[PDB]
Every structure is written in structure tokens, then in C-alpha cells.
Amino acid sequence: SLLPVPYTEAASLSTGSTVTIKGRPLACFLNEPYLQVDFHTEMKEESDIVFHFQVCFGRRVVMNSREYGAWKQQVESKNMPFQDGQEFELSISVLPDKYQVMVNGQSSYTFDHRIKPEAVKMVQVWRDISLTKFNVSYLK
Amino acid sequence: SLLPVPYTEAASLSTGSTVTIKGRPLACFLNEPYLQVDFHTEMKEESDIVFHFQVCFGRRVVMNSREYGAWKQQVESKNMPFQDGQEFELSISVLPDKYQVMVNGQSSYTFDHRIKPEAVKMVQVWRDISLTKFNVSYLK
Numbered sequence: 001s002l003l004p005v006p007y008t009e010a011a012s013l014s015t016g017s018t019v020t021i022k023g024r025p026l027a028c029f030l031n032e033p034y035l036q037v038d039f040h041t042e043m044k045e046e047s048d049i050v051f052h053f054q055v056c057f058g059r060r061v062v063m064n065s066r067e068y069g070a071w072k073q074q075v076e077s078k079n080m081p082f083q084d085g086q087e088f089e090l091s092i093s094v095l096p097d098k099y100q101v102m103v104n105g106q107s108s109y110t111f112d113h114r115i116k117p118e119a120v121k122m123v124q125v126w127r128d129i130s131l132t133k134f135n136v137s138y139l140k
Numbered sequence: 141s142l143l144p145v146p147y148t149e150a151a152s153l154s155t156g157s158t159v160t161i162k163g164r165p166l167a168c169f170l171n172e173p174y175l176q177v178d179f180h181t182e183m184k185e186e187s188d189i190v191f192h193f194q195v196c197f198g199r200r201v202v203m204n205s206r207e208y209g210a211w212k213q214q215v216e217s218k219n220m221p222f223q224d225g226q227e228f229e230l231s232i233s234v235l236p237d238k239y240q241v242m243v244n245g246q247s248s249y250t251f252d253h254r255i256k257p258e259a260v261k262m263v264q265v266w267r268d269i270s271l272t273k274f275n276v277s278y279l280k
Binding site (some may be wrong): 045066 | 146166167170171174178186206209
């Protein structure tokens with residue numbers, strides 16, 4: 001019942017869209033497994049990234065965009081709602097002005113739009129997790 | 141013909157041992173896939189690490205040890221013999237005073253022993269690679 005990782009799915013997003021991801025780190029937090037979610041402008045993996053979300057479990061989260069191939073201003077958070085050894089549910093909601101990232105139902109990170117979410121054509125979920133669910137939903 | 145990743149194998153090392161690893165990154169270098177090789181003191185993943193070798197492909201390599209659960213002095217190298225999109229052969233040779241890391245036959249990194257290599261009981265290879273070969277050999 002596991003999805004392949006790296007996991008890539010075509011996607012369209014607008015205000016009211018939510019990307020929901022259920023999975024589990026492949027290692028204990030002492031080993032610093034990573035999780036990465038990238039919202040890309042094209043299906044190709046080297047395409048620009050409207051929203052990059054990277055967890056180093058137990059340490060920090062970084063967020064950024066990659067525009068014309070170059071990483072822009074990095075944002076860092078030390079908020080760490082993820083729990084060592086546990087399955088997590090991560091949801092990324094598209095609001096008018098930002099993405100909101102919920103972890104296990106708790107608001108945990110936000111990132112103001114640098115590019116309209118309508119530029120997204122693909123989502124990739126990768127690094128040191130197993131994945132059981134990936135869903136894009138919409139509520140107006 | 142791919143080996144499972146994370147890949148864990150029991151191992152014993154001394155002067156003259158070589159760990160040889162063939163694999164390929166799972167992403168283009170622009171996406172910064174990682175590779176990690178850890179020489180552990182016990183079979184459990186949370187055990188201490190005599191030699192930690194972490195590649196961020198296209199950017200840098202860090203090396204360290206984890207002793208009584210704590211990371212020690214990080215060493216960083218910007219040497220990057222790995223080639224974007226290519227299979228690599230990595231060998232880690234145990235010398236009297238250090239590990240020598242060869243990449244595609246070229247001496248690329250070294251790390252002085254902080255703990256005797258005889259303390260190693262397990263090797264783990266993980267992060268964003270596919271793996272086709274893992275071998276421990278010995279030449280006196």
C-alpha cells in the first residue's frame with residue numbers, strides 16, 4: 001500500500017486547493033531523515049519550483065522558491081511538530097496570499113506566494129520517507 | 141538488480157579493508173540529491189557512527205563522527221568528482237591512519253580515524269540513490 005518515492009504527480013492548484021500527504025520517515029530522528037515537497041512549474045524535475053518545503057526531521061524546516069534555475073530567499077523555521085518514529089499527516093493549503101502547512105492538524109508553517117499557484121503543474125514528494133497517501137482536493 | 145535503500149549490512153573492518161559502492165543519484169544535481177554512508181558501532185540505526193560521509197551532489201561533502209549520540213567536529217569539502225546524471229563507483233579504503241575515499245578511481249576525500257575501525261559492526265548506505273553493488277573486500 002506504499003506509493004513510489006520519489007513520487008511525482010501532475011497537479012493544478014488555486015485558492016482552496018489542498019495537498020494532503022501521509023507518510024513516515026525511514027529513519028529515527030537522530031539520523032536526520034529528510035522530507036521534501038516541491039511544487040514545480042513543469043513536469044520535468046529540473047523545472048522551477050514555486051514552493052519548496054524541506055524538513056530535516058528533528059532539526060529544522062527550510063522553504064524557498066527556485067526561479068529561472070536559481071534558489072531565492074531561504075526561510076527557516078525551527079518548529080518541529082513531527083514526532084520521532086511516527087506516521088505524519090501533512091496538508092498544504094493554498095490560501096489567497098500564502099500556503100498554509102498543517103502537520104497532524106496543527107498550523108505549523110506558512111509561505112507567502114512569490115508566484116501565483118496557478119503556475120504549478122506538478123508536485124514531487126521525495127527523500128527519506130515512505131508514502132501511503134497523496135491527494136489534491138479542493139474546497140471553495 | 142537494485143539493492144534495497146536504505147541498505148544495511150553487518151561488517152568488520154581493519155587496515156586493508158575496502159567498502160565499494162556502485163549507484164546512481166535519484167535526481168538531477170540541480171535538485172541536490174543526497175548520499176549518506178555511515179559506519180556504525182552496532183547493528184541498530186541509532187548507534188554511534190565511527191565515520192559519517194554525506195554528499196550533497198553538486199554542492200559539498202560533509203564528514204563527521206557521532207559519539208555517545210552527539211555529532212563531533214564536522215569536516216567539509218567542496219570537491220565534487222561525481223557527475224550529474226551518472227552512475228558512480230565509490231570506494232572507502234581503511235588505511236592505518238585514515239579512511240581514503242575514491243570516486244571513480246580518483247582520490248577524493250580522507251578522514252583521520254577518531255575511533256579504531258575495529259569498532260565498526262555495520263554499514264548503512266542511504267538517501268537519494270539507487271544502489272547496484274555493495275561489497276566489503278580485503279587486501280593485506
